[PDB]
A paper describes a structure:
To circumvent this, we used glutaraldehyde to crosslink the [name]-[name]-17b complex to stabilize it prior to small molecule addition. Ultimately, a 3.6-Å cryo-EM reconstruction revealed that [name] binds in the predicted pocket, and major interactions involve conserved Y586 and F522 and a rarely occurring (1.5% of sequences) F518 that is found in [name] [name]. The C3-symmetric map suggests dynamic movement of the FP centered on F522 that is not simply a difference in rotamers, so we generated an asymmetric reconstruction of the same dataset (∼4.0-Å resolution) to investigate further. In all three protomers, the phenyl group of F522 appears centered between the side chains of L537 and F518, resulting in hydrophobic and π-π stacking interactions, and the cluster of 5 aromatics is preserved. The extra density near F522 in at least one protomer appears to be from hydrophobic interactions between P43 (of gp120) and the α, β, and γ carbon atoms of F522, whereas in the other two protomers, P43 interacts with either the side chains of L523 or A526. Portions of the FP in all three protomers appear to form an α-helix. Symmetry expansion and focused classifications were attempted with a mask over the FP region, but we were not able to extract any additional data (including additional conformations) that was not already present in the asymmetric reconstruction. Further assays measured an average half maximal inhibitory concentration (IC50) of 1.6 μM for [name] against [name], although the small molecule was not able to neutralize other viruses in the 12-member global panel.
[name] fusion is facilitated by the viral envelope glycoprotein ([name]), a trimer of non-covalently linked heterodimers (gp120 and gp41) (Harrison, 2015; Lee et al., 2016). Binding of the receptor [name] to gp120 triggers a series of conformational changes, including opening of the trimer, exposure of the co-receptor binding sites, and rearrangements of the gp41 helices (Blumenthal et al., 2012; Harrison, 2015; Ozorowski et al., 2017). The N-terminal region of gp41 forms the fusion peptide (FP), which becomes sequestered during the initial steps of receptor binding by moving toward the trimer interior (Ozorowski et al., 2017). Here, we identified a pocket in gp41 of our previous cryo-EM reconstruction of an early pre-fusion intermediate [name] ([name] bound and co-receptor mimic antibody bound) (Ozorowski et al., 2017) that is proximal to the FP and contains a bound detergent molecule used during cryo-EM grid preparation.
Numbering used by the authors:
A (entry chain C), B (entry chain J), C (entry chain I): 1 to 96
D (entry chain E): 33 to 124, 197 to 306, 325 to 352, 361 to 392, 412 to 458, 467 to 504
E (entry chain A): 33 to 125, 197 to 306, 325 to 354, 361 to 392, 412 to 458, 467 to 504
F (entry chain D): 33 to 125, 197 to 305, 325 to 357, 361 to 392, 412 to 457, 468 to 504
G (entry chain G): 512 to 659
H (entry chain B): 512 to 660
I (entry chain F): 517 to 660
Write the structure that this text describes.
Amino acid sequence: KKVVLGKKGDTVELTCTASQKKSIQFHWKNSNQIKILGNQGSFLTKGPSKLNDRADSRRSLWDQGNFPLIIKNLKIEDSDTYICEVEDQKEEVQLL
Amino acid sequence: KKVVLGKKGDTVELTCTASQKKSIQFHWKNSNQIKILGNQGSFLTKGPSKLNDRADSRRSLWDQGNFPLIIKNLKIEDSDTYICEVEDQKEEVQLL
Amino acid sequence: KKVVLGKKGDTVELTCTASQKKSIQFHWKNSNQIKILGNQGSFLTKGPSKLNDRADSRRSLWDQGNFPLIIKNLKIEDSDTYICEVEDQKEEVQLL
Amino acid sequence: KKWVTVYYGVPVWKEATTTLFCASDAKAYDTEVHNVWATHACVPTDPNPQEIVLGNVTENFNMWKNNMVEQMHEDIISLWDQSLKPCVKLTPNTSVITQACPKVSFEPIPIHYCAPAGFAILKCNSKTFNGSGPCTNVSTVQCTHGIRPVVSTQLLLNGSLAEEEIVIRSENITDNAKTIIVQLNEAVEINCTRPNNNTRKSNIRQAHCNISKARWNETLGQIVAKLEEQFNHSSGGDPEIVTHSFNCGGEFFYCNTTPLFNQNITLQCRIKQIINMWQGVGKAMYAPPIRGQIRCSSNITGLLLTRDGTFRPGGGNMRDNWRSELYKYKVVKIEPLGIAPTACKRR
Amino acid sequence: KKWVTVYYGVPVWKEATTTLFCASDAKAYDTEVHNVWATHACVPTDPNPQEIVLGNVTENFNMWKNNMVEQMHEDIISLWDQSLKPCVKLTPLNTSVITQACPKVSFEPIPIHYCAPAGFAILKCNSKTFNGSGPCTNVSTVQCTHGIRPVVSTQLLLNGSLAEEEIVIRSENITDNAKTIIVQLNEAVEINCTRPNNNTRKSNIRQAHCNISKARWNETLGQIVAKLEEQFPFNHSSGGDPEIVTHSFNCGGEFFYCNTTPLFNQNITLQCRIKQIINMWQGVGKAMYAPPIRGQIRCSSNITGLLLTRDGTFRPGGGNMRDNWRSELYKYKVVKIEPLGIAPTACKRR
Amino acid sequence: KKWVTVYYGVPVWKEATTTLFCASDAKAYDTEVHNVWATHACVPTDPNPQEIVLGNVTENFNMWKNNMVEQMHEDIISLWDQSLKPCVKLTPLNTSVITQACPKVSFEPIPIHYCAPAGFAILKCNSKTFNGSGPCTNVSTVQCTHGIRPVVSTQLLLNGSLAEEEIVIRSENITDNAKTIIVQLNEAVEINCTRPNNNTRKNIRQAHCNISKARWNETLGQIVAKLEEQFPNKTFNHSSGGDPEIVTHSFNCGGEFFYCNTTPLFNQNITLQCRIKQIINMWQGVGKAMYAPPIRGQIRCSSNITGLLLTRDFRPGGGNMRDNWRSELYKYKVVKIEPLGIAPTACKRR
Amino acid sequence: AVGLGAFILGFLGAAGSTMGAASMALTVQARLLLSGIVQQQNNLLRAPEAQQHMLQLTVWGIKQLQARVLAVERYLRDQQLLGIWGCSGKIICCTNVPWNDSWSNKTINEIWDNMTWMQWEKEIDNYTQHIYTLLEVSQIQQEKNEQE
Amino acid sequence: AVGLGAFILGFLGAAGSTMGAASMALTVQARLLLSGIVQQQNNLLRAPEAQQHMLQLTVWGIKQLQARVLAVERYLRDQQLLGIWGCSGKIICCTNVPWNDSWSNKTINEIWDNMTWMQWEKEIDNYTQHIYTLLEVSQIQQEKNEQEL
Amino acid sequence: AFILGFLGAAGSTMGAASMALTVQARLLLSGIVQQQNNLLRAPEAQQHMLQLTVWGIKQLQARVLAVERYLRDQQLLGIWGCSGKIICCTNVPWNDSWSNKTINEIWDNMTWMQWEKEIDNYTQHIYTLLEVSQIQQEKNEQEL
Ligand SMILES: *[C@@H]1O[C@H](CO)[C@@H](O[C@@H]2O[C@H](CO)[C@@H](O[C@@H]3O[C@H](CO)[C@@H](O)[C@H](O[C@H]4O[C@H](CO)[C@@H](O)[C@H](O)[C@@H]4O[C@H]4O[C@H](CO)[C@@H](O)[C@H](O)[C@@H]4O)[C@@H]3O)[C@H](O)[C@H]2NC(C)=O)[C@H](O)[C@H]1NC(C)=O
Ligand SMILES: *[C@@H]1O[C@H](CO)[C@@H](O[C@@H]2O[C@H](CO)[C@@H](O[C@@H]3O[C@H](CO)[C@@H](O)[C@H](O[C@H]4O[C@H](CO)[C@@H](O)[C@H](O)[C@@H]4O[C@H]4O[C@H](CO)[C@@H](O)[C@H](O)[C@@H]4O)[C@@H]3O)[C@H](O)[C@H]2NC(C)=O)[C@H](O)[C@H]1NC(C)=O
Ligand SMILES: *[C@@H]1O[C@H](CO)[C@@H](O[C@@H]2O[C@H](CO)[C@@H](O[C@@H]3O[C@H](CO)[C@@H](O)[C@H](O[C@H]4O[C@H](CO)[C@@H](O)[C@H](O)[C@@H]4O[C@H]4O[C@H](CO)[C@@H](O)[C@H](O)[C@@H]4O)[C@@H]3O)[C@H](O)[C@H]2NC(C)=O)[C@H](O)[C@H]1NC(C)=O
Ligand SMILES: Cc1ccc(-c2ccc(NC(=O)N3CCC4(CCO4)CC3)cc2)cc1
Ligand SMILES: Cc1ccc(-c2ccc(NC(=O)N3CCC4(CCO4)CC3)cc2)cc1
Ligand SMILES: Cc1ccc(-c2ccc(NC(=O)N3CCC4(CCO4)CC3)cc2)cc1
Ligand SMILES: *[C@@H]1O[C@H](CO)[C@@H](O)[C@H](O)[C@H]1NC(C)=O
């Protein structure tokens, strides 16, 4: 997996990507498969978890194949792994 | 044959029919081939004969396949045989 | 060839013809192949020579297959040959 | 020798039944019943008819066994119930319905019948055809000539002529119960007028028709000369049988023809509101006469006669009268696959 | 003599793509957007639909892998760009921002059907137990679809078709807790949305309210839950762009945003607002539309379905217009026939 | 070996004639002559041209022996007889004279083109060098020709097509001094012909045309450079005389018949001296006709000189309108395909 | 006369002569056409130029096309349906089923020279279904032995 | 459906029947149509009578014809293209290229009586190019051999 | 569309044209290549009704004419025994006097546009011979 280490009390951007350079459906989920963030076509939605708030993305880069998860005011309790669902490229990342 | 008996001065009815119930053009003629009645589609004609007058037909039944000859105020001279001209059904009926 | 002797000052009327009786392009030229007279469809044109003037035709007979060269005020100096260009019927005539 | 050989393109035609298209010169803007009806029922006619005469092919035609007649009849029923609507319509216990009666003009226009997707129509061009039997001059068309949907009885108006001779044709000419159709080779003009000054009532329903005595007698003379090779008051019945019944301008006329069958001789005509229907058995009421002056002018092209078992001019009903125009047409289809023995064997 | 034999007339289907064309009962005289668009874009409707049932042929369908969806997408975004023009359009670049004049126009989606070009036909699944994918046991062929209204809908699906007998729950993966579940109802719920002509006040002019019949709503959810419980032996949206969170829609040319909290948790009333700033569904970008119309606007719509999600006990989802089209296009696929085939036969040449 | 074999589908064309038909962008509402004629005479233009290049095909295009020219001629005659009617028409017989009213109509030639009937196609030459009637190496197949405005100008060829790269000079025999030499320009030169509002005196029949000196001089120098290819040792004069339609540069513009004195051109703002006339020698055939007196108002043409006609014995000349059309309809021929051919092969039947 | 393809045109001609003459005449026209000696006239309704001919030349235009396209389809169907008797792709198919005198006790020359197809197919119409059945049976038997 | 073809529509019904059944079905229809037993019916669209129906019955009138005309061209095209394997002008054509068990180890009656074409042409789809190549080769060799006799 | 797929070979040699037809037909039989047509669309709008109906009908008439000629010729050719075929090999020998050329010279260094000019004056003669041979062959088989 890809591991990203921050300063803990900060804002972190983790990314999922696609080689299509197209905005496609995608999702971010945690280790217990709880939705964090994802899209609905052009629209941005949040997942109903502790990361529902304090979260963002970059809608403008979805057509560049870049589908980031931005977690604001990050807590130590948030240093979990996340699974990407972009196409079938089910990559895993870890946040520290 | 369809044979009935009448009395001087009464009204009698002889009938011709068609099994198709299509108001098939018909004619009535006596034993000397004298035209009595007939239809022209929905309309009732009279033959240019001694039976021109005092003659009728229940025309509402022509559409049901029934083509009657009604002769009113009968004289003994009117008690002839009659031929039905319906389709090829050259049926004989008689008045006594 | 056809040779015509005239008198000084008269009118010549040399002719070229076509058996087709069609609207035909034709030209008259002298022995040096210098244009005298010819048509452009319905229109009459003149050639850039000494016979540019003193010349006429019969436009009304052109569709009858008759294409005259009419030289007026004939001079003995005009006693040259002339070549017809009617279709491929390149006939020659001469004046005296 | 003599082996079965299969041939394709065999030019053999047989009578067949199909549904025909109607065509007419509809205008679609003048409110008149036939042009308006035709607008949403018929197409323009074939702009380029082929009229192909098939050599000397002989074809057996029979106008009394034909079905093109029914095709015309069904269209007419729709035309009339959809246009000159009765105010009261009574028919089989029985029931009656009523309708609003806007008045409309009524001027029959020729309607042609056309056969789609094959089904060529054969036409008899013989002048001596006489209703039935082998016709010695046969041509093929896609569309028939146009027939005006005239609903007159007794004398038939605005049809075609026999051109050279009067033709007497009937299914059984020796029985005489059936109507004998006399097709004229000449037309006779009839001029029917109801002046606007006939305003009295208790008149407003009276009219007279002008017939040339000389033309009429010349015509009767030729008819008789032909009948002799084998004319009195009509016999009686409903008024559509007894009188010369016709519809013109939307008005229903009943004219007395005694003066024709017994110069400027006239028929005695009445305009009526109570009409016996020809669509089936029943009766109908139409609104009273139009105020103003009505003038009709027609071509007498045929006569419907019956005789006993010296003629009574009392014939005519709908679907029988149209046989006077459709007598020369039949629909056929081709069956190109056939067999004949020949002088060969397979391999 | 078990030799290769060549045959024609082999009715073997292959899925294929083609530039399908649209047809509609367009008018060209009423100034409304769809009938001044469809009159140049679409042809008259199919005059004689055939519905030919292909025996008992079983055919595999997959509503999430369909291509008719892309055709519908491109035509609808063209329709919108060519009609409901924003005053200000903002596209990501840095940014690119342009402006336009804003005549207001009437906007009422009409059914539009897609038709096969010559050489093609559309197969459709008539199963009452469609599922979403897999073998369909009732397949018929048509040239054209039945006609689908281009209604944006966004959260709950409006003015679509019904499942007739049972609520059908369709999902690419019903247990992945990621994809939107499309719920097709067997009954339409009537919704009456009004902005009365007395809302003339300013800070009012942007307020509107929608009335939902309680009996219909509760019965509908009871049936949905009963089915969810079979699959798996009660909340509102989690948040995000306002088009997802509220039941947004365009009606009369105006953009409504209705708060469905009262529905997900007689005459249930939702608070609705009309906005000028809308996030586009056509792609990523934003747009400004002209201010609200003075007068009274009333919309009446049929909820024929829902977009629901489930996590790793359900919520409304929304957006992703391709899914809204799938909800109606699921029954159809385009095929071509390849008539030439081969099989062993007990024969010899000569 | 070397047996006769019959092949069907052989790509061989042969020249053919047919009742070729016209198409144009006709309008039917603007009262103008061509657009009230072409609306009954011509069909709408071809919506889908193919321009198929036939490989390496080399073919002969004899413009002076073509038949497409006659079809164009007959249709133009009908157009004129049916529109710009003279009050008095005189036909040779003795004579036969008829009269007509002279309503006035505008006259602005529109491009018209010819199209092949079923079974036929038109081949066209796309080369830059044609050698007159000779063969060229760039051949394509079309259903319809390039549009040609049916202009009947005489010394100058007005509003035609350009040669694009070089001036092309054509004649059946460049040396027989009997044929008219067609010069097609690669560039157009404007001619600003005006009949102003102040010509109220009787002047009412006067007019003038303004031509750029720089353009005229450059064009004529270029023509000479090409004339030198055939006449390298030689070295444009006043016409010899004849009917006024030939002598002056005549044309029909706005319905008026102009007769312009071109002496200044064949010897900024070169001014031609023009007159408007009522008594006209017909170009349609032999005969004469009278037209109504001049229009009170202002008429301007601003026409394009796209070519000219020269004669040599290199003077301006013209007439025989069919020859102007040959230029505009240059490089097209009608052919049909004959699918059977025979060649020897190394096989035998049974 | 109804636009029944280009196929049933020369056969309207054939309807007027003997069976022998019909085969002959078709052969003659066919060689003249193959040789480029004679040409057929195309008879395609002009599509309208003007608005006044709409619903006239556009309806008759479509009607002729439907009749012709349909005629082509019908033609092709018969050409291939005839595969049952081994007569597909042919105008003339000579089979191995003999003619019975019980169908028609006539001489071949009488049949081909003194009769037209119009009469011939009526005189033996009551044997048509019978003969067609025999032809199928024969073709099946031939295939059965060809395949041994 | 309409717009798909002419030939194929006649051959599309009973698509789920076995290939054996399909052959029999075609045979009976030819018996019925060559004979005088079965009459033909048309599926043509009608031309408009009125201006109000001009767009509706002209657009679809033209589209129906285009589909049928193209269907005819495809039928006739394919009938001659197929001459490469020698099978021109045919619906059913038997050749001398043997079937391998490496393609499908099934018997003839299993294939013809218990399968539809819909399944059969999927089970052996990966041998299509191989077999077609063999058919071309066989035809070339047959022609060579006949010309040498 | 019979001529359209063949006429594009104009300018290539006779041999090249035969090879090209073989290859394209093979690709089509195998499902290797896909095609699009050149049909004109029927009008969407009433305003385009004359424009897309006149040409709509004319294009269909042309295609119908093309099939009628195709089918007509495929059967007229029965006279020479060439019906039902695109390529028909007969038993009439080539008379060298018609060309005096080699088969390879004709097929490889010439196109059909040239070949059919070279032997144009023998066209009727050859056609006559083809008919004669077919007549004799039919008799020879019927005589057995
Ligand atoms: C055989 O063929 C001939 C043709 O060759 C047929 O003859 C035609 O018959 C019609 C019969 O109606 C006749 O039509 C009238 O022509 C008048 C011309 O001036 C019109 O004015 C008149 O219209 C009025 O009457 C109509 C009712 O019939 C109304 O519907 C219409 O609105 C008009 O009515 C208004 O005006 C009148 C007059 O002031 C007033 O009284 C009304 O109240 C109202 O205000 C008809 O159109 C044709 O002119 C005849 N043609 C010829 C050449 O003579 C003949 O009928 C055919 N025979 C058969 C049996 O069908
Ligand atoms: C689901 O389907 C249903 C149908 O089954 C759809 O329901 C229809 O929705 C439209 C929405 O606009 C509605 O149309 C209006 O009807 C009104 C009837 O009174 C009209 O008055 C109104 O026209 C005005 O508004 C237009 C702009 O919206 C203007 O362009 C037009 O010129 C009119 O505006 C002028 O006049 C008004 C009034 O005086 C004034 O206020 C304005 O300022 C201006 O001067 C529309 O035509 C239909 O009536 C509804 N149909 C039914 C049966 O209810 C529903 O929308 C679909 N759902 C979805 C989500 O798409
Ligand atoms: C080569 O091509 C060019 C195009 O590139 C052609 O140039 C066009 O020529 C036409 C014809 O002259 C010209 O059309 C006129 O434009 C005028 C603009 O003011 C209009 O006013 C004029 O209409 C009047 O005259 C018509 C008769 O000619 C009348 O029918 C019409 O009803 C108008 O009549 C009123 O006005 C007149 C004039 O004052 C008055 O006498 C009347 O009583 C009445 O009051 C025409 O529409 C185009 O404008 C020219 N185009 C350009 C770009 O300049 C050129 O003609 C072609 N060359 C050749 C030889 O054909
Ligand atoms: C435009 C068009 C062209 C052709 C056709 C067509 C119709 C029917 C068949 N029939 C067939 O394939 N059969 C199989 C073989 C058999 C059994 C022994 O002979 C006869 C029946 C073929 C083509 C349809 C439309
Ligand atoms: C209406 C219409 C009818 C038929 C056609 C048609 C198209 C292509 C061919 N193909 C061909 O002629 N070939 C040559 C012979 C060969 C080489 C070895 O076999 C195969 C390829 C034939 C007819 C098109 C349209
Ligand atoms: C769409 C279409 C168009 C035209 C045709 C058509 C084909 C052939 C003939 N020819 C004929 O019947 N002949 C008789 C038998 C013979 C002599 C030895 O072979 C050849 C000549 C007529 C029309 C068919 C379909
Ligand atoms: C039904 O939907 C589920 C969704 O998870 C899918 O797995 C299954 O394959 C679909 N079809 C059938 C026939 O079960």
